[PDB]
Amino acid sequence: STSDLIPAPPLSKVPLQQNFQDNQFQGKWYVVGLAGNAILREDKDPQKMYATIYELKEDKSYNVTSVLFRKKKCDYWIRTFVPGSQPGEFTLGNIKSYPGLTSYLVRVVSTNYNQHAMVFFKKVSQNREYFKITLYGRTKELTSELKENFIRFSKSLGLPENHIVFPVPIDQCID
């Protein structure tokens, strides 16, 4: 391996949603926008929308399930997000069970809980530092104002246009 990556931005460029409400953030969210240093536009085979479901467990950790449509099937990915240093931040539970992963951070940047959200993730895997930002929607469509905003924020973190995509709405699996 030889890879080049846009550097993760310093945490100080990533706002935190104030007064984060874990109970209201629960439920299903669609990924209407996706940006990151390992995210690449692929005009030939554009990326399909997928969904991520947050369920609060009794201990207040989230059970996180992502579902995507691939090879005619629904693929499910499950992880645990445990509360971090402040409300709206999380780290990954059982980091141990993933070979090569030494750090994982989740920070809710902003959300109104019933329509949209922007979430920043940063991780270190096989010693490479990765980051992405998701534009989450309670519905598969969001105003063009929210999309531009997500675009400005992604760029403010060093990401150019070809590292920012808007997955295509589908009906399979995510409904």
Ligand code: CM2
């Ligand atoms: O996207 C969300 O809404 C939030 C997430 C919650 C669930 C956790 C799924 C588990 C692990 C994981 O997510 Fe992934 O998550 C990241 C977190 C922080 C920084 C960068 C990334 C990623 N992930 C993407 C990626 O390409 N990962 C690798 C390496 C794959 C294993 C490590 N990654 O990279 C890969 O080859 O994946 C193939 C594509 C695929 O289907 N994977 C999807 C799985 C479902 C959620 C979307 N996603 O985010 C994917 O990776 C690109 O940047």
